[PDB]
C-alpha cells in the first residue's frame, strides 16, 4: 500500500520552509534559508542552487515543464529564476510581504498573495500589474490553482476564508466558510492551507484546529472530515496517489506524528511516525509515486506505493 524508500538529508541545520517536487516526478527543490537544493532521484546526485533573495524564503514554485523556479520572500521580492540561466524577472509589486504562490497551468501567470488584503497578478513577459483582488480580511497563506485546468483560484487566509476567486477578470465567485464575524466570538477557526485535488473538483483544507476536510466547492458544503485522534503552525497538506483504489491524504502535526486518512471511507490504516520525532513539520509535496516531506529541520523522506 505504502512503504518507506530512502532518506538522504540530515535533520539539523538552517531554516527549512518548503519542499517541492516538479510535477515531472524527478526534480526536487528544497527551500532552505535563502538556498535551494536539487536532488535528482534517478541517479541520486545533489545540486545546490542559490538565488538573489535576501530573507527567509516562503514561496517556492515549480514549472509544469521544469524549466523555471519562482520564489518569493518578504522584502517585497517577486522573483522568477531559471534552472540554469539565472534570475529572469523581478516584479516587486506588493506593498505587503508574500507567503505562497502558484502557477497558471499554461505557465504564463505566476499568481501572487499580498498580506494587506489584496491579491494581484503578474505576467512574465509583460511584467505589469494585471489585476487586483482586494477581497480579504487577513493575511493570505496559500492560493492553489488546480492541477488540470487553470480556471479558478481558491484562496486561503488567516481569518477563516475558504474563498474562491476568478482568474479571467478577478472577482469573488464562492466562499465556503464565514469570516471573523457571523458569530464574532472566536467561533470561526483560522485556515492554514487550501488545496485542490487532481481533477480540481474537490477542494482540501487544513485549519488551525488541525482538522482536515474535503470540500465540494460546487454544492456549498463538505463531504468529508478528518480529525486527529490546536496547532501553532502553517503546515502543509498533500494527497498522495497510489495506483490502486484509494488515494490517502496527508498533513503534518505539531510534531512528527503523520497519520494518513482513507478518503473513500473514513478510516485510518497507515501512519508514518517513525521519522521527524523532534522536528515540527511545515511542507509536503509529491510526485507520481515519490512523496517528500520537510520540517523546521530538513528531513526529506521519500516513499513508494
Amino acid at each position: 500500500m505504502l512503504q518507506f524508500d530512502k532518506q538522504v538529508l540530515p535533520a539539523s541545520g538552517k531554516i527549512s520552509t518548503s519542499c517541492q517536487i516538479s510535477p515531472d516526478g524527478e526534480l526536487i527543490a528544497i527551500c532552505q534559508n535563502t538556498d535551494m537544493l536539487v536532488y535528482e532521484i534517478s541517479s541520486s546526485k545533489m545540486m545546490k542552487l542559490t538565488t538573489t533573495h535576501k530573507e527567509c524564503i516562503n514561496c517556492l514554485c515549480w514549472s509544469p515543464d521544469s524549466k523555471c523556479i519562482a520564489s518569493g520572500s518578504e522584502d517585497f521580492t517577486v522573483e522568477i529564476t531559471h534552472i540554469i540561466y539565472g534570475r529572469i524577472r523581478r516584479l516587486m509589486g506588493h506593498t505587503a510581504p508574500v507567503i505562497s504562490i502558484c502557477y497558471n497551468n499554461k505557465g504564463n501567470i505566476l499568481c501572487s498573495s499580498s498580506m494587506d488584503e489584496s491579491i494581484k497578478e503578474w505576467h512574465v513577459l509583460s511584467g505589469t500589474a494585471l489585476k487586483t483582488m482586494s477581497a480579504h480580511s487577513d493575511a493570505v497563506v496559500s492560493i492553489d490553482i488546480p492541477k488540470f485546468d487553470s480556471s479558478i483560484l481558491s484562496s486561503g487566509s488567516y481569518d477563516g476564508l475558504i474563498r474562491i476567486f476568478d482568474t479571467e477578470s478577478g472577482h469573488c465567485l464562492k466562499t465556503l466558510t464565514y469570516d471573523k464575524d457571523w458569530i464574532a466570538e472566536d467561533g470561526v477557526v483560522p485556515i492554514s492551507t487550501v488545496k485542490f485535488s487532481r481533477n480540481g473538483k474537490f477542494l482540501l483544507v487544513k485549519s488551525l484546529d488541525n482538522v482536515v476536510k474535503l470540500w465540494e466547492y460546487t454544492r456549498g458544503t463538505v463531504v468529508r472530515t478528518f480529525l486527529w485522534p490546536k496547532l501553532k503552525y502553517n503546515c502543509g497538506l498533500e494527497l498522495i496517489y497510489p495506483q490502486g483504489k484509494d488515494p490517502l491524504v496527508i498533513s503534518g502535526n505539531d510534531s512528527g506524528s503523520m497519520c494518513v486518512w482513507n478518503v473513500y471511507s473514513k478510516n485510518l490504516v497507515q501512519k508514518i511516525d517513525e521519522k521527524h520525532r523532534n522536528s515540527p513539520l511545515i511542507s509536503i509535496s509529491a510526485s507520481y509515486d515519490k512523496v517528500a516531506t520537510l520540517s523546521l529541520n530538513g528531513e526529506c523522506n521519500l516513499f513508494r506505493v
Binding site: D65, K67, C68, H82, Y85, G86, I88, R89, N104, K106, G107, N108, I109, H123, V124, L125, S126, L130, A135, P146, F148, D149, S151, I152, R163, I164, D166, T167, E168, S169, H171, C172, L173, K174, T175, L176, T177, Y178, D179, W182, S197, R198, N199, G200, K201, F202, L214, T218, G220, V222, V223, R224, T225, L239, Y241, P247, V263, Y264, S265, K266
Partner: protein, 408 residues
Amino acid sequence: ANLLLQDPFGVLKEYPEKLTHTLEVPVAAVCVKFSPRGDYLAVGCSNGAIIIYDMDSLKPIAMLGTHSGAHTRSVQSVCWSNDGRYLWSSGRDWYAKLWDMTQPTKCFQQYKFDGPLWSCHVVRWNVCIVTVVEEPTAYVLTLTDRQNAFHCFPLLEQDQDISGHGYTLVACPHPTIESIIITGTSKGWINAFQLDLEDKIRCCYEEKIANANIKQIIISPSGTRIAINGSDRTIRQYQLIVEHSVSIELEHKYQDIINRLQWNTIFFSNHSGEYLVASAHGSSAHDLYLWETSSGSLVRVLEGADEELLDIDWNFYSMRIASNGFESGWVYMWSIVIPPKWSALAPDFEEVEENIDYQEKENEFDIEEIAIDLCTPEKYDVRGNDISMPSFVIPIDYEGVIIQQHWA
C-alpha cells in the same frame, strides 16, 4: 472550464453582446483566427508579421516569422489543427508555411507559389487546401511522409470543365464527413469534391445559384447549414444533405435593404448554427450583425465599434468575436461579461431583484459517505463542448527568455 460553473445563477448566453477588450496593434491586420481553445489568437498582420496573442492579458507570447519563413508580403488566411499544435498560413508572398509551435519561431515546410493566394483550409492537420489565384482547380498541398513532396493535387476531374465558371476561389471542408470538400467557383457554380485521402475525386455536386464572385462558403459545425456569400448583396444559407450524394435547398436570404452593402465575412454559431453573423463592407457600417437563422430577422447588432470590420472569428469556449477594424488596424473584441456577485461574500446571501413579501412562519418567535472519485477529469462543461481533450499548450519561449529584458 470552471469559471462558468460558478459565474451565473445558471443562465449563460449564446452570443456576446458587449465589447470589452481592444488589442492595440498599430500595424494593421488581415485575418484573426483563434486557437481551437480560447487561449491563443493568431493575427494575420498586414506587413507580413504574425503577432500571436495570449487571450488573458492582451500582450503577446511569440511571433511566427523570426527564424525561418517570415512573410515578406501580406498574410491572407490561417487555420489551426485539431489540437492547436500547428498553424497553416497562407500569404501574399507566394508562400504557405506550415508552422509548429514546438519550435515557435521556425517554419517546417514551405512552397514557392506561382502567384499570390486568397485563403487556406485544413482537413487534417497536415493537408491543407489553398486557393491559388487565377486557377480553376485547387492545388491542395499535403505534407507527406517526406515534407518536400507537396503533391499539387488538382481538385478537378480530368474531363470536367468549369469553363464559364471562372476560377475556384473558396474551398471549405466538411465537418462531419471530413472527406467531401465544398468549393465555389468565381462565377456562380458550386462543386463538391470527395477526396479519398489515393487521389480519386468525384464531382458529386455541381450547380449554379446566381452569377457572382463567391467570396466565402461556410458550413455550420453540425454539417446541416451552409451559407454562401456572393459578390452581390445577398447571403444564401442552404441546408446540406450528405449521406457521396449531395443536394441543397434554399433556406433564407439576408440582405441590407437600406444601404445595400456587401458582406465581407460570415460566421455561424457553435452547435447547429442557430445564429449567423456578418460584417458589411461600406463605410458608416460600424457594426457586426446577427440573424436568427430560422426566422430570418435582424435580431441583434454588435454596436461597439467605430470603423469598418473586415474579418471575424467566433471561438465557442470564450464566446468572443475578434475582428480587425480595417481602417485603424486594431482588433476589436467582444466578450460575454459576467457582473460581480456579493452573494459569494458569505455562504448565504441572496440577490433578489424585488422587495419580496415573505410570509410569516411560526419559527420567528421560537428560541456523510457519498461516493468520492479523484481520478477522472471533467467531461462536459456548462456550454457542452468537446472538453476532456487536454489541448496542446503553446510553450513559451524557453530558449531566450533570459534575453527578454535586453533588446527584444
